[PDB]
Amino acid sequence: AKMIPIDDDKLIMEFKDDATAFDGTKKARFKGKGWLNAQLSVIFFKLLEEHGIKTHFIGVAGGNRLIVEKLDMYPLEVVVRNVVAGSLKKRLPLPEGYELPEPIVELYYKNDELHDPMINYYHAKVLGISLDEIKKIEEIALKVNEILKDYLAKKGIILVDFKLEFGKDKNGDIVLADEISPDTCRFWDAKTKRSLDKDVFRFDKGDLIEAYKEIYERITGEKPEF
Amino acid sequence: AKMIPIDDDKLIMEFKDDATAFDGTKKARFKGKGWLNAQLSVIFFKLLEEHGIKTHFIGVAGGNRLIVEKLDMYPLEVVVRNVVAGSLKKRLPLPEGYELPEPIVELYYKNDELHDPMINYYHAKVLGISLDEIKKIEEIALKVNEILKDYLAKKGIILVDFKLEFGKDKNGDIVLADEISPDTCRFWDAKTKRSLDKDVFRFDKGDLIEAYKEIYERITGEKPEF
Ligand SMILES: Nc1nc2c(ncn2[C@@H]2O[C@H](COP(=O)(O)O)[C@@H](O)[C@H]2O)c(=O)[nH]1
Ligand SMILES: Nc1nc2c(ncn2[C@@H]2O[C@H](COP(=O)(O)O)[C@@H](O)[C@H]2O)c(=O)[nH]1
């Protein structure tokens, strides 16, 4: 769905029209999805930067391309969950739609060989990530959560869960990386509880592009120009 | 492999000759195993009690039966790992036998429906277990680890990993429960690195009873009387 090096300080992140699911056993191509996800990442990164979150966003380079800061990437995917959906149904005997009493943070080791298994703080330590780093990472993820869920709730969108990735900059500061989009979040309409995210593609729920268009219109206030 | 109520304060824990593996898809019966595991649990509980670990062990009731304290059981299995073996090979790209730089503690939610999935502190909280409780539980597991690994290393046995369970007594103190035996630990001979534990049954490595007998002889100093 997405890195083209420039130099020491920066690289290009390009969003593609490809989508994969289920460990890459399901593939399809959606015209315009690159564009939507690039635009929506920019909007989210900017909102978070205003709230004092250090992100890798530097600028736009036209098309579906962002200029981003180069980082020593942690091999983690950091998942924040507000509402029970997806893999959480297999870890806790709770139904889809269940509202958690407080946010859940899950750590996944980015490892294709092992299919991205969940880890805790001890596994992370063996992977070279101190407890203090983990604490800072979860603290940021949790703050990101509050900002994004408030912003979206005030637009008729429930932030069900989402995935973040992080890296360290040259000062040793922890920096939010990768993307933030309907590909990497669960977004539900506040009224109907309908999916406006990758679950439309994952579980064949309708038209992916239309659901992404609705999110873009309902966030930005104007329909997608492309 | 094992509860017969007495009253409010206590119950009977009986160790049986049955063994199961792989989610109960593998079954077999081993004459004498109940007896060995009961005796070895007693020895371990006593050693830990001397070192100031609160356990549910009250007394022996002859045969393969222990008198134990009744508790509000946490629905957890708490795993401590010193050497890479078993499921850890699927979570970290490390070989069997790899010596961890420090102990790993893993939490599993005891749930047959969900096949005992791993959890973190956030899942535990949703299950009703405060962060403070979790911290006390891991602190005890880690202390138990030091005591058991020292004691066994001074007998030519490597403590690879093991599983603990816990409950709360009426004072709200956290109490070590279930069993401690070759069923619930990985034990390797310090020289040959051979298994003297349930892995003999799990992966058809030889004679289970003989491996358990060796552990009993090499711990107690005398061969099993039965
Ligand atoms: N695009 C993408 N999203 C992910 C991945 N892993 C987790 N997520 C996001 O994180 C949340 C939880 O995922 P789950 O564990 O339920 O599959 C969902 O919003 C999901 O979209 C991934 O590998 N790719
Ligand atoms: N008897 C028993 N032992 C377990 C269970 N779950 C974990 N253990 C113990 O905890 C350690 C780690 O298990 P693993 O996750 O590698 O299967 C091993 O020593 C194993 O014997 C269980 O359900 N039953």
UniProtKB/Swiss-Prot annotation, chains A, B:
PANTHER family named among the record's database cross-references: MULTIFUNCTIONAL PROTEIN ADE2, SI:DKEY-6E2.2
CDD domains per record: SAICAR_synt_PurC
Catalytic activity: 5-amino-1-(5-phospho-D-ribosyl)imidazole-4-carboxylate + L-aspartate + ATP = (2S)-2-[5-amino-1-(5-phospho-beta-D-ribosyl)imidazole-4-carboxamido]succinate + ADP + phosphate + 2 H(+)
GO BP annotation list: 'de novo' IMP biosynthetic process; cobalamin biosynthetic process
Keywords: ATP-binding, Ligase, Nucleotide-binding, Purine biosynthesis
Cited NCBIfam families: purC
One of the record's GO molecular function terms: phosphoribosylaminoimidazolesuccinocarboxamide synthase activity
Family membership noted in the UniProt record: Belongs to the SAICAR synthetase family.
EC number: 6.3.2.6
Protein name: Phosphoribosylaminoimidazole-succinocarboxamide synthase
EC supergroup of this enzyme: ligase
HAMAP family, alphabetized: SAICAR_synth
Pathway(s) served: Purine metabolism; IMP biosynthesis via de novo pathway; 5-amino-1-(5-phospho-D-ribosyl)imidazole-4-carboxamide from 5-amino-1-(5-phospho-D-ribosyl)imidazole-4-carboxylate: step 1/2
Keyword Ligase: yes
Organism: Pyrococcus horikoshii (strain ATCC 700860 / DSM 12428 / JCM 9974 / NBRC 100139 / OT-3)
SUPFAM superfamilies: SAICAR synthase-like
Gene: purC
